[PDB]
Design a protein around this motif. Structure first.
Motif, PDB file in Angstrom:
ATOM      1  N   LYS A  76       0.822  -1.205   0.000  1.00  0.00           N
ATOM      2  CA  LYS A  76       0.000   0.000   0.000  1.00  0.00           C
ATOM      3  C   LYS A  76       0.858   1.258   0.000  1.00  0.00           C
ATOM      4  N   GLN A  77       2.050   1.198   0.601  1.00  0.00           N
ATOM      5  CA  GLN A  77       2.944   2.351   0.536  1.00  0.00           C
ATOM      6  C   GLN A  77       3.519   2.528  -0.867  1.00  0.00           C
ATOM      7  N   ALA A  78       3.882   1.423  -1.517  1.00  0.00           N
ATOM      8  CA  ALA A  78       4.380   1.467  -2.885  1.00  0.00           C
ATOM      9  C   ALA A  78       3.352   1.992  -3.875  1.00  0.00           C
ATOM     10  N   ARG A  79       2.081   1.601  -3.731  1.00  0.00           N
ATOM     11  CA  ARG A  79       1.048   2.150  -4.606  1.00  0.00           C
ATOM     12  C   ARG A  79       0.965   3.665  -4.481  1.00  0.00           C
ATOM     13  N   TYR A  80       1.026   4.185  -3.254  1.00  0.00           N
ATOM     14  CA  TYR A  80       1.022   5.632  -3.068  1.00  0.00           C
ATOM     15  C   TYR A  80       2.247   6.269  -3.703  1.00  0.00           C
ATOM     16  N   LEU A  81       3.410   5.641  -3.551  1.00  0.00           N
ATOM     17  CA  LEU A  81       4.622   6.183  -4.151  1.00  0.00           C
ATOM     18  C   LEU A  81       4.670   6.004  -5.660  1.00  0.00           C
ATOM     19  N   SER A  82       3.700   5.293  -6.238  1.00  0.00           N
ATOM     20  CA  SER A  82       3.563   5.161  -7.691  1.00  0.00           C
ATOM     21  C   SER A  82       4.690   4.321  -8.283  1.00  0.00           C
ATOM     22  N   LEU A  83       5.309   3.491  -7.447  1.00  0.00           N
ATOM     23  CA  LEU A  83       6.277   2.505  -7.906  1.00  0.00           C
ATOM     24  C   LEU A  83       5.602   1.321  -8.583  1.00  0.00           C
ATOM     25  N   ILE A  84       4.400   0.966  -8.139  1.00  0.00           N
ATOM     26  CA  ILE A  84       3.600  -0.087  -8.759  1.00  0.00           C
ATOM     27  C   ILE A  84       2.184   0.443  -8.954  1.00  0.00           C
ATOM     28  N   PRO A  85       1.448  -0.024  -9.958  1.00  0.00           N
ATOM     29  CA  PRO A  85       0.125   0.545 -10.224  1.00  0.00           C
ATOM     30  C   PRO A  85      -0.898   0.134  -9.178  1.00  0.00           C
ATOM     31  N   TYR A  86      -1.971   0.922  -9.105  1.00  0.00           N
ATOM     32  CA  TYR A  86      -3.076   0.583  -8.216  1.00  0.00           C
ATOM     33  C   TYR A  86      -3.897  -0.566  -8.784  1.00  0.00           C
ATOM     34  N   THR A  87      -4.475  -0.369  -9.966  1.00  0.00           N
ATOM     35  CA  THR A  87      -5.225  -1.408 -10.653  1.00  0.00           C
ATOM     36  C   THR A  87      -4.721  -1.516 -12.083  1.00  0.00           C
ATOM     37  N   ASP A  88      -4.657  -2.751 -12.573  1.00  0.00           N
ATOM     38  CA  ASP A  88      -4.183  -3.046 -13.925  1.00  0.00           C
ATOM     39  C   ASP A  88      -2.821  -2.416 -14.209  1.00  0.00           C
ATOM     40  N   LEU A 119      10.875  12.128  -1.961  1.00  0.00           N
ATOM     41  CA  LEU A 119      10.299  13.199  -2.761  1.00  0.00           C
ATOM     42  C   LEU A 119      10.273  12.835  -4.241  1.00  0.00           C
ATOM     43  N   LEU A 120       9.183  13.231  -4.900  1.00  0.00           N
ATOM     44  CA  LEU A 120       9.022  13.122  -6.345  1.00  0.00           C
ATOM     45  C   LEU A 120       9.061  14.527  -6.931  1.00  0.00           C
ATOM     46  N   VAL A 121       9.965  14.753  -7.881  1.00  0.00           N
ATOM     47  CA  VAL A 121      10.228  16.084  -8.419  1.00  0.00           C
ATOM     48  C   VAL A 121       9.883  16.112  -9.902  1.00  0.00           C
ATOM     49  N   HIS A 122       9.273  17.215 -10.329  1.00  0.00           N
ATOM     50  CA  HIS A 122       8.913  17.415 -11.724  1.00  0.00           C
ATOM     51  C   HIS A 122      10.178  17.442 -12.582  1.00  0.00           C
ATOM     52  N   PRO A 123      10.269  16.602 -13.621  1.00  0.00           N
ATOM     53  CA  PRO A 123      11.518  16.526 -14.396  1.00  0.00           C
ATOM     54  C   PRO A 123      11.918  17.818 -15.090  1.00  0.00           C
ATOM     55  N   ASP A 124      10.982  18.724 -15.377  1.00  0.00           N
ATOM     56  CA  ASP A 124      11.375  20.007 -15.950  1.00  0.00           C
ATOM     57  C   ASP A 124      12.178  20.830 -14.951  1.00  0.00           C
ATOM     58  N   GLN A 125      11.872  20.697 -13.661  1.00  0.00           N
ATOM     59  CA  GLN A 125      12.635  21.346 -12.607  1.00  0.00           C
ATOM     60  C   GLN A 125      13.667  20.423 -11.974  1.00  0.00           C
ATOM     61  N   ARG A 144      15.726   9.298 -12.718  1.00  0.00           N
ATOM     62  CA  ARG A 144      14.540   9.440 -13.551  1.00  0.00           C
ATOM     63  C   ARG A 144      13.784   8.120 -13.552  1.00  0.00           C
ATOM     64  N   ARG A 145      12.481   8.180 -13.311  1.00  0.00           N
ATOM     65  CA  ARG A 145      11.658   6.980 -13.295  1.00  0.00           C
ATOM     66  C   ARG A 145      10.313   7.237 -13.953  1.00  0.00           C
ATOM     67  N   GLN A 146       9.855   6.239 -14.700  1.00  0.00           N
ATOM     68  CA  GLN A 146       8.492   6.193 -15.183  1.00  0.00           C
ATOM     69  C   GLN A 146       7.541   5.990 -14.011  1.00  0.00           C
ATOM     70  N   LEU A 147       6.453   6.745 -14.019  1.00  0.00           N
ATOM     71  CA  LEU A 147       5.401   6.556 -13.041  1.00  0.00           C
ATOM     72  C   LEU A 147       4.527   5.389 -13.473  1.00  0.00           C
ATOM     73  N   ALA A 148       4.045   4.640 -12.485  1.00  0.00           N
ATOM     74  CA  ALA A 148       3.110   3.562 -12.765  1.00  0.00           C
ATOM     75  C   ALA A 148       1.807   4.095 -13.337  1.00  0.00           C
ATOM     76  N   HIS A 207      11.698  12.658 -10.843  1.00  0.00           N
ATOM     77  CA  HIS A 207      12.982  12.535 -10.173  1.00  0.00           C
ATOM     78  C   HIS A 207      12.754  12.078  -8.739  1.00  0.00           C
ATOM     79  N   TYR A 208      13.397  10.976  -8.361  1.00  0.00           N
ATOM     80  CA  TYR A 208      13.173  10.355  -7.062  1.00  0.00           C
ATOM     81  C   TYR A 208      14.334  10.656  -6.124  1.00  0.00           C
ATOM     82  N   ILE A 209      14.023  11.250  -4.972  1.00  0.00           N
ATOM     83  CA  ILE A 209      15.032  11.635  -3.990  1.00  0.00           C
ATOM     84  C   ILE A 209      14.687  11.010  -2.647  1.00  0.00           C
ATOM     85  N   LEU A 210      15.677  10.404  -1.996  1.00  0.00           N
ATOM     86  CA  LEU A 210      15.502   9.811  -0.677  1.00  0.00           C
ATOM     87  C   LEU A 210      16.473  10.447   0.306  1.00  0.00           C
TER      88      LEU A 210
END
Lengths: 52, 117, 62, 88, 104
Positions: free
Chosen positions: A40-52, E8-14, E44-48, E58-61
């Motif tokens: 559920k944390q990964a879905r929020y972080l958008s690392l994995i999709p919510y559905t499909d 943090l997730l950062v807009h790639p233009d910035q 840089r990462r593709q969003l699900a 842009h992913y920052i930890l």
RNA sequence: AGUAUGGGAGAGGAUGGUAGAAUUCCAGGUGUAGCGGUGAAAUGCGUAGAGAUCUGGAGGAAUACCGAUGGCGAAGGCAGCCAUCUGGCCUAAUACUGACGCUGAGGUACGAAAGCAUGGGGAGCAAACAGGAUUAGAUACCCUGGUAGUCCAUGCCGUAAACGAUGUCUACUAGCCGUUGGGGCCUUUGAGGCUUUAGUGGCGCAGCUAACGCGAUAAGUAGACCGCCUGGGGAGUACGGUC
């Protein structure tokens, strides 16, 4: 376990994106609870999709 | 007039009717037909035979626009989904992929009361 | 997402998709969404299901 | 919330011997400090009934220990209530 | 003090500003107090799924140890900065310093 | 019976943020005669353009999968994720106090849903009500709409088949099979097997019961304190009183 282990997390996700039950996977209860939290944390972080 | 090779079929199959809509991609309608439009009035609108009849009419109508391969989406728990998807192949299109897109709430609104029939 | 390969027939595609949807169980949720189930009835049904499950497990053990 | 340092200072101040942690004086002092600390919490969250039950239990335990100490030794009871500023 | 982990997730233009924002936050942490146990740039990462019609990020930890006031300032800065579109803050007990996955 | 120090599990409580799915409405493309609903119909919506499909916007309420004869709480009850404040419980070994205990008439605190007061909010659902059916009649069940209310803040009300129809505390009395949170031992490399403890379930000897059944979570064997019953109606009613 934690949400950054996406390769491990995909092992407990169906093709639709739903969490797989412990009765099917063979998991301990506490490990399953930690798995659900991390997923559920990964879905929020958008690392994995919510559905499909 | 417009020509397009790849299209999308939408089968909205409820328990009272079935609507077959043929569009192109990006969702612009091209042709459609329902069981009500071929007689079949009243409760007979939900039979699989009516769904097949509507699907044939829709496919033949879209043949004028000239589609050869299409992608099919079925939503609703209707009794005519299988007949509607089968009739398209009989008409002569190539079904590249056919899927289910029924919506499911994540515990949202409250549904109506239960019928005490 | 039933994507057909080069040469299966329409009927084969239909039956494989029907099997996929039966595995997915979307229709169960759609049926459940038709009418509102009260929490009392939901708890009663789940208790009955648990009892049936435990009865099945002992039978399969013996 | 009180921490280990504050609790250690309270124990050191009210101890009646070496390694003494079970004496009624020490127990009553710790309970009084805890109640006085939780007063501020209950100022902000007026509707925390579930925590207020624990607060009431603390109050009752302090009262019972004070009654036992008064029954045993009166001068120690007076000294303790004077030191903590309790009205009774 | 308490240990926090921030993503943090950062807009790639910035993304050309990510170095500046990260050193600004780290510095503010330093004059507050702070101990940056870890900083990782996943890149840089593709969003699900798209966020606000954005598909790359842009992913920052960061791993920090701060107080309540510093945490509040960090949260308000994250809220008001438009480049930061999403952030996750988790309290942990223990300092984490080892290199984690996704740092590749 | 209680206290200090290490560790652990949890939808326990209060406050504030935030995410995705879906419903309704609005604006705009594509597009054209139906849609909707039922046992069958009709009321209703639509050629000043619906329904279907695609894009964008607004708002409210609830948190799929995980999910479990699972967990937490005195009970009522508590489910997305994050932060802050906060109660209780389990577990190991020393150390400390030295009967500090149990129950509890009056009293006092909490207490589902509906309901009431003041101010907000209102997507969906829906008492009252309106129309269409059915019927000998329909006042109802079915269908199309729909206002209180359901939501929030601050208070009141104090009732439920508020049920395990089983008051609280303590000790003792064959076994077998599960499950949750811990401790210990054993293998031997990592997954299993024995024990012990606190919960939660299914059978069952003795014993108990009118019978059904209960059976270490007793309705068995005993002790302490409290509440209550004395044929069915009239009746949880009248009068008086308190709120």
């Amino acid at each position: 376990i934690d949400y950054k282990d996406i390769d491990t997390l995909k092992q407990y996700i169906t093709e639709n994106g739903k969490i797989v039950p412990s009765r099917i996977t063979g998991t301990k209860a506490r490990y399953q609870r930690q798995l659900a939290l991390a997923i559920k944390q990964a879905r929020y972080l958008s690392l994995i999709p919510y559905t499909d | 007039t417009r020509t397009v090779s790849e299209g999308v079929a939408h089968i909205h199959a409820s328990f009272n009717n079935t609507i077959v809509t043929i569009t192109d991609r990006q969702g612009n309608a091209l042709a459609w037909a329902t069981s009500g439009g071929q007689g079949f009035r009243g409760s007979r609108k939900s039979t699989p035979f009516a769904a097949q009849v509507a699907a044939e009419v829709a496919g033949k109508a879209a043949l004028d626009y000239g589609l050869k391969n299409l992608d099919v989406l079925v939503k609703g728990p209707g009794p005519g989904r299988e007949s509607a998807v089968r009739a398209l192949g009989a008409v002569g299109y190539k079904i590249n992929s056919i899927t289910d897109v029924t919506p499911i709430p994540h515990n949202g609104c409250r549904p109506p009361k239960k019928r005490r029939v | 997402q039933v994507k057909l390969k080069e040469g299966e027939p329409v009927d084969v595609a239909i039956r494989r998709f029907k099997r996929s949807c039966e595995k997915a169980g979307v229709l169960a949720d759609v049926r459940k969404r038709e009418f509102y189930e009260k929490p009392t009835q939901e708890r009663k049904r789940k208790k009955a299901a648990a009892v049936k499950r435990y009865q099945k497990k002992l039978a399969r053990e013996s | 919330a009180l921490t280990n340092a504050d609790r250690a200072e309270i124990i050191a101040k009210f101890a009646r011997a070496e390694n003494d942690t079970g004496s009624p004086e020490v127990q009553v002092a710790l309970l009084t400090a805890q109640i006085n600390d939780l007063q501020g919490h209950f100022k902000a969250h007026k509707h925390d009934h579930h925590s207020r039950r624990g607060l009431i239990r603390m109050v009752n335990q302090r009262r019972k220990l004070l009654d036992y100490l008064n029954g045993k030794d009166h001068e120690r009871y007076t000294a303790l209530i004077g030191a903590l500023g309790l009205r009774r | 003090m308490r240990h926090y982990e921030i993503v943090l997730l950062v807009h790639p233009d910035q993304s050309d500003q990510v170095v500046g924002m990260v050193e600004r936050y780290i510095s503010q942490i330093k004059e507050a107090d702070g101990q940056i146990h870890r900083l990782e740039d996943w890149g840089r990462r593709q969003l699900a799924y798209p966020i606000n019609k954005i598909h790359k990020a842009h992913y920052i930890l960061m791993n920090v140890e701060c107080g309540q006031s510093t945490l509040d300032e960090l949260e308000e800065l994250f809220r008001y900065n438009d480049a930061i579109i999403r952030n996750l803050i988790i309290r942990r007990e223990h300092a984490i310093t080892e290199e984690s996955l996704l740092a590749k």
